[PDB]
Amino acid sequence: RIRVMPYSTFRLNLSVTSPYNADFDGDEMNMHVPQSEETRAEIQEITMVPKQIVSPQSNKPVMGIVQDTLAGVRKFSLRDNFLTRNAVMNIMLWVPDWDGILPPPVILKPKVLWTGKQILSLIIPKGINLIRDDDKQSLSNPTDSGMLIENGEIIYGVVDKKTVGASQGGLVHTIWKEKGPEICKGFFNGIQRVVNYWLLHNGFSIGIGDTIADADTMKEVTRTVKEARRQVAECIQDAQHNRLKPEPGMTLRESFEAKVSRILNQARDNAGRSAEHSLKDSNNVKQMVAAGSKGSFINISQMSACVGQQIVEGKRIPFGFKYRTLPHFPKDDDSPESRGFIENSYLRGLTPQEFFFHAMAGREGLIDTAVKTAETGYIQRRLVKAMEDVMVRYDGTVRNAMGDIIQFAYGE
Amino acid sequence: FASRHGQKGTIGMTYRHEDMPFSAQGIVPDIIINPHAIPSRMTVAHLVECQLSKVSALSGFEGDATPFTDVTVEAVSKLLRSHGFQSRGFEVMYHGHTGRKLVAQVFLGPTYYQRLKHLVDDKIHARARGPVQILTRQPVEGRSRDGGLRFGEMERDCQISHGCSSVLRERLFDCSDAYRVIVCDICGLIAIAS
Amino acid sequence: AEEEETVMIAMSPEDLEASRQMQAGYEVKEELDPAQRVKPAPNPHVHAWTHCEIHPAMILGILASIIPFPDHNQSPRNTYQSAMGKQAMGVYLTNYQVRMDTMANILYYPQKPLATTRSMEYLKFRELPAGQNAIVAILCYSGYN
Amino acid sequence: NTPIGRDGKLAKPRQLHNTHWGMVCPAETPEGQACGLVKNLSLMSYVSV
Amino acid sequence: MNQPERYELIELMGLPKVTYELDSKSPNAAVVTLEKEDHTLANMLANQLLSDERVLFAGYKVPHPLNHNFILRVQTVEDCSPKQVIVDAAKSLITHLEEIKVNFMREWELKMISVEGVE
Amino acid sequence: DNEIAGQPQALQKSGRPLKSIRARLKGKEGRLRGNLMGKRVDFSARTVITGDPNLSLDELGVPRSIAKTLTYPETVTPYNIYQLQELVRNGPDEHPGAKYIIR
Amino acid sequence: ETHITIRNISKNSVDFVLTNTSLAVANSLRRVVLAEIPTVAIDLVEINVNTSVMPDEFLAHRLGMIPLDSSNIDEPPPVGLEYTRNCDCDQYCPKCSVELFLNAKCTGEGTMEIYARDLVVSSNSSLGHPILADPKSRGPLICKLRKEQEISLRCIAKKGIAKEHAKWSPTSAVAFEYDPWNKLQHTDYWFENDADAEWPKSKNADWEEPPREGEPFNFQEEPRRFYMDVESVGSIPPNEIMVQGLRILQEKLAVLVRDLDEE
Amino acid sequence: MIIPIRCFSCGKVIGDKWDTYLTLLQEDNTEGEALDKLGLQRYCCRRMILTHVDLIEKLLCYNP
Amino acid sequence: SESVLLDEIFTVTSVDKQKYQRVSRITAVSGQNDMNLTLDINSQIYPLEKDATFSLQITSNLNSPDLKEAADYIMYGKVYRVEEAKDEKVSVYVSFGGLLMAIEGSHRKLYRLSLDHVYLLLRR
Ligand SMILES: [Mg+2]
Ligand SMILES: [Zn+2]
Ligand SMILES: [Zn+2]
């Protein structure tokens, strides 16, 4: 629904960005205005950001809380975050449909305090239930683990992507679908308004420090990496005495390549897994991830631990010219210390003899992204051009253009 | 705008001086990017640059950024508290509305962003009964003055998914080529109509 | 390019010095180095080298040699900036005022990249910057960014 | 350029070849379509008169 | 090209600076909408308005950083007013301001003497 | 058929095929997939997008610059006459205005 | 009681400390000083001839920011002109806008360097006169010339506040820091290895506690004592700004009361 | 072209503070650090005289 | 309607204080070894150490004056979930929007069950 601001761009709603798989990289989007009062009706009663928050592609939602309002939810649904009576008040002016009644305080002790879950569960409808039950979870809490709501009030665990993102039994899914879009449509307006407002005065951000692993615990990183050299040494030379062996799938040279990309890949995980398992829970970028907002375990390990080894057509840096990866190496140097495989992260970070290997692995998913940009489109039209034909006839059956019937149900 | 690391950015808002987090030195950010444009796009250089730019604070020593050198994060850091600040870039920050310290610490630190070309006032477009070709009698192409747009095959296949007979018909046989003709009932052809 | 095949270049003089010391057995000293580009030590066989690369930073595009800390990004990001850089804005020629020329874009106030590489003195880049230094602050603040 | 071109157009040469190191030509091509079909001369590149 | 007029930031386009209007829901509680003046005046009648035991709520929030205005809700409950609660507040403010406007004009010239003079 | 696979030439100017009728039909670069399938259209527009946290979900910020150039006919209801008239008397250069009056 | 405790002063900044007052008022004073504080600045140039290198567009924007004397301002009729918007006269008149001149030519062959000095007011001791931040110089730099490149400009200033364009605020920045240790923990410092060990104590940190204990931390406690530090441009004396800060901040509270007791 | 005048972040005038600046880093043997002697405690704007390019001496010599 | 639901003394044996700034779950154990209790509580304002002793109460009202004054910590939250295991006995889990409760003792006490929120009261 238009209206109507100034400045010359289209303002639109962040939680609606996922459906348009396109950021604000200076993208353009087209607007088509209806004329006749008979179409104005179609694109109001059938097609509407609201009645389109759940595509039947997957009978799962397609929009959800994402980006900063999401990172924010976690960092605010914590039972470590109390609200000063001082507002509360202020933040109550979003809802946007307010009972008018100020929520009964959870803390009557010396100061009057409100839990971050309290005032959040306010912008959720009344009478939706959820029993998320995550992995480890006990009669206890045991430690804000899991999630569970009652008469439109949470009481258990912590809100993150697990629940306010396009999840299966997702909270977004669950009020849609009980009771239809709106207050459903308001849900995104409340949280995406309350929280943004919280976050405004909570502040959140990340710097390098969030990328630099503990000094002591970084010694143990470089140990388990150089301690996987020895695991190649016992392969580069032990498979020159024909004592591999190989099998299956073959071949023998390949079943060697295998037992390495396997050790190099796994050996990395250890360095990364330890790098994170040694980072205060309250470390920006690590919390940005726990939320779900953006980026992942493999993003942290590559930034603060190592990086390589990089690939290409299913085989570590290929040889050629001659029998060598590059002119700064011997010949037959089937070692990581050369063939695509970095030991440092974007902190030290990368070494020349490495920098290139990385850039040329990069230029692969850089053309493999050039394809999916077109091909993907070609295959799309194929189907359409053979399925336009079909549609569901008033008889309760799906039929061809010519009447030739293809299904006796509506989809079996 | 974008830095020199492929942080394609666009302006979203223009806050006046008071609103912005005046802190605590107390300067004010000239522009402020969002933290989610870091971890996934792993671009730890953008960070480094800012920790180093800063260090051409109480020095002015043009800090070299040479591709492969001994210069390290751990190196510049020491050079940081060396001027009284946090050996990691950060700083405490005061909200513009209230004065409340922000719970979290901000990574504030200079860098140069590039004013990219193709501005907005050159990219906005609006049609509505504009000129049309002579041969096909449909709407002209971009520019000119100044329509129309473009309703792809792709595009149309999507109305059909929803099911909008009328929108569809409207945006193809009305909002472009509203043309009527009169047909003979026996041999269906153009007549001598008046 | 075809001459490479028959040659054996070195990366950094340091590597050559270490190899020379080994030819007679000489401590390595790997317990003194601090956070840095962990090289491949020591040196696999290879008794003597043939040539050694001038500096690994001349292995760069003309437009990519303007990017702080190149060897430090995710790679894919590196490919960018360069292609986009050309779409930057700034002063292109000291004499634009005299050249009548269609579509030209200059900067009211251009500035030196602050943290810049020792490879611009040649790209005459500090003399006609595309950049402009901006007190930036990465914050999650409001919701418009 | 890289005539061509009209003989694919899937991989080859596009992809970066170890051979490029030096006269690199690092990572500075167009976004899509003609990736790695255009290339730029390194800083030290010298072309044979 | 679509830049709102700046002078239309500091000049009420025939818009009633203040507007006082009850709510419903809530009972004995009204909502004030000062225009073309915000983000300064507002914050005060809060972190100070809440200091009067007579109060039971203190709204305050700009609806959109483009419109240069802001609302203020007050509930009370139960005797008056609340047009009177905010004025009793405003009054307590202007008078608390001079408290410092005077100390300033008092201690200024007083530490102006120690840095030589003369007269 | 300019080139019916026989070696005719059909050169009209500078030895260049003579734009035939079969050429326009199945171009491409013509009808078929450009004048019958995907047709431009009118009453539309586009521009760069931006974020805003303050709009309802089913909300879209439309710049006046555009709003002042769209429509959106709308017949004269007996419920509008007065309301609808104000618009005209306002002008097409004042958001709450209009362009064209059909009789 | 007190309320303020100044330390050092100079000619461009005023370091001091607030006492018995609330956070709100603090900030609300920070803001006031950075925005709505009437000043003179030039906001209209007419060009006659300009064959220099700075375009007309580029001069307007530059001739603008150059500070001017304001002093009293809010005290008409003379020694102070009311906004040129709500004036008793029509269009533009010297009764509510100060005229400025710029007739720079070239008599040399080397190089010219025209500063803020060369301008000419009118002689109405307003003022008026720009400023000369530079030490025994002549003012902020405007433009350079070579051979015959005379420019002729007519400038007239109006009255405006930062809000209307950053051009007006006679105020550089402000430097507050309530609770320098961490009494109220209004902030969660990022470690990284040891808290009170990474973050630098501040010069203004040596005026308080509460290290030791483990009291444990209080909470009935509100933030009082704010260490501000106002710095002016040099357009109007170093407060001035502050003084005139509340004068049009009280009067902003009043507006309110009067619109509620009359009816 | 010529110093910006008025720093980008604050208001601190910098039109005045250059005819004097350049007469130190090339005329007094003091460091980039010498600007500190011009009242530049903030980042801030002081990266204004520092990161600047004198694009007018090299533009002024095109005489019509 | 005096509907007190708790009048028993407890003591602290362990406290975490697990990477949370405020809040800390504590442990009781009283009476015949078969009591034990456990709850999250703001450790910023009302810290508790070992051998903290001193009882607690709950009820649901409301009018009294002394009780309101007494104690230095009060909360309020529904119960939602009260199952029974291991020799009859009841275990009740009350939530205070995040901060969680747990008790293990048979009928008497039992006037509880009812989920009509609770109001927890702590006196030292
Ligand atoms: Mg992308
Ligand atoms: Zn006048
Ligand atoms: Zn500045």
Residue of chain G nearest B17, judged by CA positions: G34
* Å from CA of H46 to ligand 3 middle: 6
Angle between helices A254-276 and A216-226 (to 10 degrees): 170
| Residue of C136, I71, A289 lying closest to B112 (CA atoms) | C136
Angle between helices G23-34 and G243-261 (to 10 degrees): 110
Structural domains present in chain H = 1-64 (1.10.10.60)
Q: Is A376 exposed, middle or buried (0-12, 13-18, 19+ CB in 10 A)?
A: exposed
Is the distance from CB of G235 to CB of E69 less than 8 angstroms? no
Query: How many whole angstroms from its chain centre is CA I15?
Result: 15
Give the Å distances, CA to CA, from F1 to F8, F19, F23.
10, 9, 8
- The domain spanning residue A188 has which CATH number? 1.10.274.100
What would the two tokens of residue B53 be? 């730019």
| Residue of H61, A29, I121 lying closest to B124 (CA atoms) | A29
Cis bond leading into C136, ω under 30°? no
CB contact under 8 A, F52 and C144: yes
Amino acid at position I111, single letter = Y
Distance between CA A108 and CA I76 in Å, rounded? 8
A interface mutation test: which of G192, G215, G220, G222 has the most A CBs within 10 A?
G192
Q: Is B139 exposed, middle or buried (0-12, 13-18, 19+ CB in 10 A)?
A: buried
Q: Show residues of chain G in contact with B87, CB under 8 Å.
A: 198
What is the SS3 string spanning A190-204?
A: HHHHHHHHHHHHHCC
| Residue of I44, I81, I63, I61 lying closest to I121 (CA atoms) | I61
DSSP letters for B53-119: HHHTSSS----B--SS-S--HHHHHHHHHTTTS-TTS----B-SSS-PBPSSPPEE--EE-B--S--
* Å from CA of B21 to ligand 1 middle: 29
Resolution of the experimental structure, in angstroms: 3.7
First CA to last CA distance, chain I: 25
What would the two tokens of residue A111 be? 């100061």
Structural domains present in chain I = 1-124 (2.40.50.140)
What would the two tokens of residue A284 be? 């920006």
Amino acid at position G72, single letter = N
Strand order in the sheet with I25-27: I15-16, I25-27, I38-40
Tracing tokens 């472009």 back to the chain, one arrives at B176
Q: Which residues of E55-92 are buried (b: 16+ CB within 10 A; e: fewer)?
A: bbbbbbbbeebeebbbbbbbbbbeeeebbebbbbbbeb
Q: What is the CA angle G209-G214-G220, rounded to 5?
A: 70
Residues making up the annotated binding site of A for Mg(2+) are 23, 25, 27
CB contact under 8 A, E65 and B19: yes
Distance between CA A405 and CA A395 in Å, rounded? 11
Q: Which residues of A326-365 are buried (b: 16+ CB within 10 A; e: fewer)?
A: bbbbeeebbbbbbbbbbbbbbbbbbbbbbbbbbbbbbbbe
What would the two tokens of residue G11 be? 């000619």
Is the distance from CB of G117 to CB of G60 less than 8 angstroms? no
Is the distance from CB of A125 to CB of A175 less than 8 angstroms? yes
Report helix, strand or coil for I23: coil
Is the distance from CB of A347 to CB of A209 less than 8 angstroms? no
I121 pairs with which residues across the strands? I57, I74
Is the distance from CB of G133 to CB of G141 less than 8 angstroms? no
Report chain G's C-alpha Rg in angstroms. Answer: 24
What would the two tokens of residue F19 be? 């734009």
- Eight-state DSSP code of residue C143: S
What is the SS3 string spanning chain A?
A: CCCCCCCCCEEEEHHHCHHHCCCCCCCEEEEECCCCCCHHHHHHHCCCCCCCCEECCCCEECCCCCCHHHHHHHHHHCCCCEEECHHHHHHHHCCCCCCCCCCCCCECCCCCEEEHHHHHHCCCCCCECEECCCCCCCCCCCCCCCEEECECCEEEECCCHHHHCCCCCCHHHHCCCCCCCCCHHHHHHHHHHHHHHHHHHHCCCCCHHHHCCCCHHHHHHHHHHHCCCHHHHHHHCCCCCCCCCCCCCCCCCHHHHHHHHHHHHHHHHHHHHHHHCCCCCCCCCCHHHHHCCCCCHHHHHHHHCCCCCCCCCCCCCCCCCCCCCCCCCCCCCCCCCCCCCCCCCCCCCCCHHHHHHHHHHHCCCCCHHHHCCCHHHHHHHHHHHHHCCCEEECCCEEECCCCCEEECCCCC
What would the two tokens of residue C102 be? 């269609």
What would the two tokens of residue A63 be? 């929009």
- Eight-state DSSP code of residue C95: T
Of H3, H42, H64, the CB nearest to G141: H3
Distance between CA G87 and CA G76 in Å, rounded? 12
Q: Does H6 reach chain C within 8 Å, measured CB to CB?
A: no
* Å from CA of A25 to ligand 1 middle: 8
- Eight-state DSSP code of residue H30: -
Is the distance from CB of B192 to CB of B184 less than 8 angstroms? no
Residue of chain A nearest B97, judged by CA positions: A201
Query: Which residues, at least 6 apart from E79, have a Cβ–Cβ distance to it below 8 Å?
Result: none
Tracing tokens 């609302």 back to the chain, one arrives at E71
Query: How many whole angstroms from its chain centre is CA G56?
Result: 26
Shortest distance between the Cα of I1 and any Cα of chain G, in A, equals 33
Amino acid at position A280, single letter = K
Q: Is B60 exposed, middle or buried (0-12, 13-18, 19+ CB in 10 A)?
A: buried
Q: What is the CA angle H33-H36-H39, rounded to 5?
A: 165
* Nearest ligand to residue A26 Cα: 1
φ, ψ at G16 (rounded to 5°): -160, 180
Q: Does A209 reach chain G within 8 Å, measured CB to CB?
A: yes
Enclosing H/E stretch for E59: none
Angle between helices E83-107 and G23-34 (to 10 degrees): 70
G11 pairs with which residues across the strands? none
- Eight-state DSSP code of residue G128: -
Assess whether A186 and A287 both reside in one domain: no
CB contact under 8 A, G53 and C108: no
From the CB of residue A131, how many other CB atoms can be counted at a distance below 10 Å? 10
A334 pairs with which residues across the strands? none
Query: Which residues, at least 6 apart from B1, have a Cβ–Cβ distance to it below 8 Å?
Result: B9, B10, B11, B31, B113, B114, B115, B116
Is the distance from CB of G33 to CB of G230 less than 8 angstroms? yes
Of B22, B27, B92, the CB nearest to G30: B22
φ, ψ at G191 (rounded to 5°): -50, -85
Is the distance from CB of E64 to CB of C144 less than 8 angstroms? no
Distance between CA B60 and CA H33 in Å, rounded? 6
What would the two tokens of residue A95 be? 């809802």
Q: Show residues of chain E in contact with B20, CB under 8 Å.
A: none
Distance between CA E85 and CA A156 in Å, rounded? 40
Q: Which residues of C43-72 are buried (b: 16+ CB within 10 A; e: fewer)?
A: beeeeebeeebebbbbbbbebbbbbbbbbb
Q: Show residues of chain F in contact with B140, CB under 8 Å.
A: 40
Touching, I vs D (3+ Cβ pairs under 8 A) = no
Distance between CA A9 and CA A15 in Å, rounded? 18
Report helix, strand or coil for G42: strand
- Eight-state DSSP code of residue D29: -
The domain E1-119: what is its CATH number? Answer: 3.30.1360.10
Domain boundaries, chain G: 1-38+167-263, 39-166
Size of interface G-I (CB pairs under 8 A): 7
What would the two tokens of residue A273 be? 């897994």
Is the distance from CB of A339 to CB of A316 less than 8 angstroms? yes
Query: How many whole angstroms from its chain centre is CA I121?
Result: 8
Report helix, strand or coil for C18: helix
Q: Show residues of chain F in contact with A6, CB under 8 Å.
A: 63-64
Residue of chain A nearest B48, judged by CA positions: A208
Q: Is B129 exposed, middle or buried (0-12, 13-18, 19+ CB in 10 A)?
A: middle
Report helix, strand or coil for H8: coil
What would the two tokens of residue G154 be? 């007519």
From the CB of residue C73, how many other CB atoms can be counted at a distance below 10 Å? 30
Residues making up the annotated binding site of B are 184, 187
| Overall size of chain E counted in residues | 119
Distance between CA F42 and CA B150 in Å, rounded? 8
Assess whether A340 and A274 both reside in one domain: yes
Residue of chain G nearest B23, judged by CA positions: G175
What would the two tokens of residue C122 be? 């040649």
CB contact under 8 A, A359 and D27: yes
What would the two tokens of residue A5 be? 């601001």
Distance between CA G175 and CA E95 in Å, rounded? 26
Q: In F1-103, where does DSSP find H-type helix?
A: 21-25, 64-67, 81-90
| Residue of G123, A79, C114 lying closest to B111 (CA atoms) | C114
φ, ψ at E29 (rounded to 5°): -165, 130
Distance between CA I88 and CA I84 in Å, rounded? 6
Q: Which residue segment(s) compose the domain that A119 sits in?
A: 53-205
Give the Å distances, CA to CA, from C115 to A269, B51, C54, C110.
34, 10, 23, 15
- Eight-state DSSP code of residue C126: T
Task: Say yes or no: domain G1-38+167-263 is CATH 3.30.1360.10.
Answer: yes
Give the Å distances, CA to CA, from D39 to C55, C68, C82, C125.
21, 21, 12, 21
Q: Does E2 reach chain A within 8 Å, measured CB to CB?
A: yes
Of G23, G179, G187, the CB nearest to B103: G187
Shortest distance between the Cα of C96 and any Cα of chain A, in A, equals 28
G7: left (phi over 0), alpha (psi -120 to 50) or beta: alpha
Q: What is the CA angle A25-A27-A30, rounded to 5?
A: 165
Give the Å distances, CA to CA, from E70 to B94, E100, I12.
22, 27, 50
| Overall size of chain C counted in residues | 145
Query: Which residues, at least 6 apart from G138, have a Cβ–Cβ distance to it below 8 Å?
Result: G115, G116, G117, G132
Enclosing H/E stretch for D41: none
| Residue of F47, C66, C116, C80 lying closest to B7 (CA atoms) | C80
Q: Does G31 reach chain E within 8 Å, measured CB to CB?
A: yes
From the CB of residue F18, how many other CB atoms can be counted at a distance below 10 Å? 13
CA atoms within 13 A on the CB side of I28: 22
What would the two tokens of residue G216 be? 């444990």
Strand order in the sheet with G151-160: G39-50, G151-160, G98-104
Tracing tokens 């072209």 back to the chain, one arrives at H1
| Residue of I25, I28, I24 lying closest to I11 (CA atoms) | I28
Distance between CA D33 and CA A374 in Å, rounded? 10
Tell me which residues of chain C have a C-beta less than 8 Å from any C-beta of chain G.
Answer: 97, 108
| Overall size of chain A counted in residues | 412
- The domain spanning residue A254 has which CATH number? 1.10.132.30
Question: Out of 3.40.50.720, 2.170.120.12, 3.30.70.3420, 3.40.50.460, which CATH number does the structure's domain G39-166 have?
Answer: 2.170.120.12
Of F54, F70, F75, the CB nearest to A33: F70
Q: Show residues of chain A in contact with I45, CB under 8 Å.
A: 109-111
CA atoms within 13 A on the CB side of E85: 30
Tell me which residues of chain C have a C-beta less than 8 Å from any C-beta of chain D.
Answer: 1, 4, 54, 58-65, 75, 78-80, 82-83, 119, 122
Task: Say yes or no: domain B132-194 is CATH 3.90.1800.10.
Answer: yes
Distance between CA B49 and CA G123 in Å, rounded? 52
| Residue of B14, H10, E7 lying closest to G159 (CA atoms) | E7
φ, ψ at B140 (rounded to 5°): -60, 180
Report helix, strand or coil for C53: coil
| Residue of H31, G199, H16, A393 lying closest to H48 (CA atoms) | H16
Residue of chain G nearest A208, judged by CA positions: G192
